Design a protein around this ligand. Structure first.
Ligand code: CL
Ligand code: CL
Ligand code: CL
Ligand code: CL
Ligand code: CL
Length: 506
């Protein structure tokens, strides 16, 4: 929401942590921050949220940047939360001097329980000078410092759990920070860092997933307690899908146990994986704008997303033909010659804009086995884009159909017939060999021994022959295979062997 937004003067920010790849969850946040900045002719910041040290097997900044670019989302400037550590320490000391923060040595358990029943910690009435001595203990990372945290002094009997003295600063000496190594011994918490950094970076409208705690009241308290320029904060609903593993632990488990080969595998929820699967950014954003709110912990179905994507791509992608390579059946039109005839057709029967292709045909054709099995003698069918034929005799040898002889009747009425089938010309030196990948979800349950619900058999490969014209497609082109479905060209192997990912269609 854009409470009191001023045209030309809105600043939003997308703040992903830099210890992982962007995934579809991130997408709603990135999109809404851009949608509202553009609505008000404002700007969107990119901020890498690195307030606390992590052990990162990579610097994900570059991948996050390129995913944002691939979604069309541009940002005015890039910052890191850790850019503001010194300022945040300043503000922590300010808090301490106004008696709005104190140092607490209480253990984890005792502190959680105290907060539950609303009893004030023994240290809540520590003196300002003592709180400062202990904060400096934390700053230098001494034995005493590592036993202390800084907490906000708010209201322990508040109805809101987030207002009962939330931690502001922790002392962490063992894990190094990806930017500052061990230069910092204490680190601000997310709850403290977030409002201050928003105010001092010039954010006007902070957007955030609803975490179903009233963190908004606490955020505002920090801004008002410290007398900072005010920031509006609004919480939207999280985007999460059924049958989708988001736990980083389980995702790396997949990678390491060779269920998938990389984090870009098309079954992964990463932005790259799902674009590899054939989703358009236009579909993602339209789905987001149209989905409406969702309540706590609800999970979307994939069907409306892939149906929107289908409606988008159907009118602007070319159509080709493909048959099963190993089980295709030879069809002979015994009235024609083996002279190869070549005729121009539209790549799209309703969109001459995408242009023309060349169609080759012969006396000899390949058709699908399941199509051959339905044919019987003196049946008038239609070879799509070519014309009617009349089947003559099905030459079956020991049950396995081996041949079908027919006769051209191309000038017959293509409406009379009810069987319309796709075909390839039998020109093996020109047909394109392709591998087709039909993917399925990595787990079988909508949500969570979990290894018991992994679909290890979720990458189905099949080998096909495709029409020659498909040679013109470049990597990441999307298209339709007649009577088969929607596909995206993923890779061109040696000898122009194509690797094609079936796009879910809903
Ligand atoms: Cl805590
Ligand atoms: Cl919402
Ligand atoms: Cl999970
Ligand atoms: Cl792969
Ligand atoms: Cl059909």
């Amino acid at each position: 929401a854009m409470a009191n937004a001023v045209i030309g003067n809105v600043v939003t920010r997308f703040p992903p942590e830099p210890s992982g790849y962007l995934h579809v969850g991130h997408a709603k946040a990135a999109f809404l921050n851009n949608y509202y900045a553009q609505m008000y002719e404002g700007k969107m910041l990119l901020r890498f949220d690195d307030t606390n040290p992590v052990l990162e097997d990579i610097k994900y900044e570059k991948s996050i940047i390129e995913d944002l670019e691939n979604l069309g989302l541009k940002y005015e400037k890039i910052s890191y939360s850790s850019d503001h550590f010194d300022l945040l320490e300043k503000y922590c000391i300010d808090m301490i001097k106004m008696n709005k923060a104190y140092a607490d040595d209480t253990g984890v358990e005792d502190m959680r329980n105290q907060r539950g029943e609303g009893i004030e910690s023994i240290n809540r009435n520590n003196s300002i000078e003592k709180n400062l001595e202990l904060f400096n203990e934390m700053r230098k990372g001494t034995e005493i410092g590592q036993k202390n945290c800084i907490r906000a002094k708010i209201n322990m009997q508040s109805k809101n759990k987030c207002m009962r003295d939330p931690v502001m600063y922790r002392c962490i000496v063992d894990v190094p920070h990806h930017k500052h190594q061990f230069k910092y011994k204490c680190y601000p918490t997310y709850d403290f860092a977030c409002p201050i950094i928003d105010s001092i970076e010039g954010v006007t409208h902070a957007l955030r997933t609803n975490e179903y705690s009233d963190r908004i009241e606490q955020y505002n308290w920090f801004i008002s307690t410290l007398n900072l320029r005010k920031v509006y904060i609004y919480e939207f609903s999280r985007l999460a899908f059924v049958k989708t593993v988001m736990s980083k632990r389980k995702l790396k488990w997949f990678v390491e146990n060779n269920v998938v080969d990389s984090w870009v595998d098309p079954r992964f929820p990463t932005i790259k994986g799902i674009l590899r699967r054939g989703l358009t950014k236009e579909a993602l954003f339209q789905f987001i704008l149209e989905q409406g709110p969702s309540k706590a912990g609800n999970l979307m179905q994939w069907d409306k997303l892939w149906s929107i994507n289908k409606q988008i791509i159907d009118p602007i992608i070319p159509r080709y033909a493909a048959v099963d390579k190993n089980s295709s059946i030879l069809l002979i039109l015994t009235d024609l010659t083996d002279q190869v005839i070549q005729k121009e057709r539209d790549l799209h029967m309703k969109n001459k804009s995408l242009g023309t292709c060349n169609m080759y045909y012969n006396n000899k054709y390949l058709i699908e086995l399941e199509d051959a099995q339905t044919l019987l003698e003196n049946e008038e069918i239609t070879l799509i884009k070519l014309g009617n034929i009349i089947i003559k005799n099905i030459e079956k040898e020991n049950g396995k159909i081996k041949q079908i002889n027919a006769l051209s009747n191309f000038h017959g009425d293509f409406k009379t017939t009810k069987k319309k089938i796709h075909w390839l010309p039998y020109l093996p030196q020109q047909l394109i060999t392709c591998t087709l990948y039909e993917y399925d979800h990595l787990i079988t349950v909508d949500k969570f021994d979990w290894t018991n619900f992994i679909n290890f058999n979720s990458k189905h490969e099949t080998l096909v022959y495709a029409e020659p014209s498909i040679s013109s497609l470049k990597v990441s082109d999307k298209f339709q295979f007649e009577r088969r479905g929607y596909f995206i060209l993923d890779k061109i192997d040696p000898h122009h062997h194509l690797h094609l990912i079936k796009i879910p269609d809903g």
